[PDB]
Write a protein that binds this ligand. Structure first.
Ligand SMILES: CN(C)c1noc(C2CCNCC2)n1
Length: 185
């Protein structure tokens, strides 16, 4: 792909984070804390899952960013509507305003309804995410495997501003403490 030149500088929005997340001072890294992080509750925070949004809102154009997932067992990545539900249980699906992929129990899947099996020969250490707002496209690239395509959502009905979306995942196993990091341009 040749999407690298639409690179955007993404930062994380503390105020949207689940109350167990620790966002670095530069707002470029997030990890699961071992306890509630001593913050007040607010209506923006994801209550049920270890999720956080980027600060940037996109309503036009072409945007690209990269996320480091080294040594994690579980995570979700992509984009979502600014108006997604924050409280209670919900599924990651385009019907609920999410365009995502994930790793879960040694398999990669796209957040369609129902979910779609991905075919990845080289486990990725970094993921590239491309959004073309006007075309209605969200694509995912395997940076570890020379930028190979992982998945394309097409005919997307965004129906609002989009925000970068992140889930660091739970750490029941002790093998999923590693952070998500936004990679430099
Ligand atoms: C409702 N949420 C977000 C929540 N409550 O407890 C927990 C812990 C569950 C085991 N691992 C650390 C997090 N998460």
């Amino acid at each position: 792909h040749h999407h690298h030149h639409h690179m955007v500088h993404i930062t994380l929005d503390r105020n949207t984070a689940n109350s167990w997340l620790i966002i670095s001072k530069d707002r470029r890294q997030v990890r699961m804390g071992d306890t509630h992080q001593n913050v007040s509750d607010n209506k923006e925070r994801f209550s049920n899952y270890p999720m956080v949004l980027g600060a940037q809102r996109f309503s036009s154009g072409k945007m690209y960013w990269e996320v480091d997932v080294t040594q994690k067992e579980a995570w979700d990545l992509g984009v979502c509507r600014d108006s997604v539900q924050r409280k209670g249980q919900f599924s990651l699906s385009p019907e609920n305003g999410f365009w995502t992929i994930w790793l879960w129990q040694d398999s990669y899947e796209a957040g369609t309804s129902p979910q779609t099996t991905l075919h990845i020969q080289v486990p990725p250490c970094q993921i590239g995410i491309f959004v073309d707002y006007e075309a209605g496209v969200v694509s995912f690239y395997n940076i570890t495997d020379h930028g190979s395509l992982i998945y394309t959502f097409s005919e997307c009905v965004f129906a609002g501003p989009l925000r970068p979306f992140f889930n660091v995942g739970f750490n029941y196993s002790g093998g999923n403490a590693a952070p998500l990091k936004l990679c430099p341009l």
